[PDB]
Amino acid sequence: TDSIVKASNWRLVEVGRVVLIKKGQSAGKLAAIVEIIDQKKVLIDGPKAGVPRQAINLGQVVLTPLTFALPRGARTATVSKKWAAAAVCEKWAASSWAKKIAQRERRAALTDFERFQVMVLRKQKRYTVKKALAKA
């Protein structure tokens, strides 16, 4: 006797929404939405990661699931204060998204001897995995 409505989980464009710049000079750095200009334009500010306070489109921008409590139009010192108080970078680096960015950077930063060691170790782990697959 209960109504059941699916309630699609969207990352909102809100003040304090932590975003990830994907295009431009920052390009992989986090910032915080500080004000909303229009539907397509926001004012972000990324003071710990080095992003300047700027008006950016929401098309150079990926909203992350992270949100910290930030007042609207907060200047850069306030944004850095609330950011470091709410520990945005520590909460970001624990996510499976930032671990995937770090993993693909590490994989691209592998050398040839490290790729050889990856092959040797993958065969070694494969032996135990395929051995236990038959038993279980």
Binding site: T1, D2, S3, I4, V5, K6, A7, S8, Q39
Partner: protein, 190 residues
């Protein structure tokens, strides 16, 4: 003008389960069940407190948020049709030839036949949509009552029974003859 966020307010009474998946609404009440497929609209349904469901359009134009109140009225019609039901009463209007309307059975299909419409030898058959039940009112002369859970089914079956009795090649301002909807209402209403 691209409105930021428009909201409408579907109120859910007691005994009524409005379960909404993607855009397939299922309303179950004391009278039965109704299912609508609203996958052509692009709205977002959110349940608030089991007696209220908001429906929303984010970044919608005028023609898009025009459909939001249509959706709210459609789910409200489902709720009203499974709580109070729907009941459309039609009257037979004739000048000389009495319109003989019966309910007939044709290989398990439940037609309404209309004989002697303007002295026609043609028998006008209107199938009965499922969910719609037909009765003929005692103590009200020449009244047929179409009632059911669905306002769309009931009102379209009433419209079909009206449109089968249209007058051809005559001045329809004088030949006013047919079956017309005289009342739209609910089954258990007071």
């Amino acid at each position: 003008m691209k409105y930021i966020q428009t909201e409408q307010q579907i109120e859910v009474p007691e005994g009524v389960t409005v379960s909404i998946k993607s855009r397939i609404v299922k309303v179950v009440g004391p009278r039965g069940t109704l299912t609508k497929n609203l996958k052509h609209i692009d709205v977002t349904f959110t349940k608030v407190n089991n007696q209220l469901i908001k429906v929303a359009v984010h970044n919608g134009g005028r023609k898009h948020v025009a459909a939001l109140r249509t959706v709210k009225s459609l789910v409200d019609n489902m709720i009203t049709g499974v709580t109070k039901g729907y009941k459309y009463k039609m009257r037979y209007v004739y000048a000389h030839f009495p319109i003989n309307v019966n309910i007939v059975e044709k290989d398990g299909a439940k037609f309404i036949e209309v004989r002697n419409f303007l002295g026609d030898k043609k028998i006008r058959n209107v199938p009965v949509r499922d969910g719609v039940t037909i009765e003929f009112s005692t103590n009200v002369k020449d009244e047929i009552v179409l009632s059911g859970n669905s306002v769309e089914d009931v009102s379209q079956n009433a419209a079909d029974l009206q449109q089968i009795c249209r007058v051809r090649n005559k001045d329809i301002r004088k030949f006013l003859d047919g079956i017309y909807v005289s009342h739209k209402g609910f089954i258990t209403e007071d």
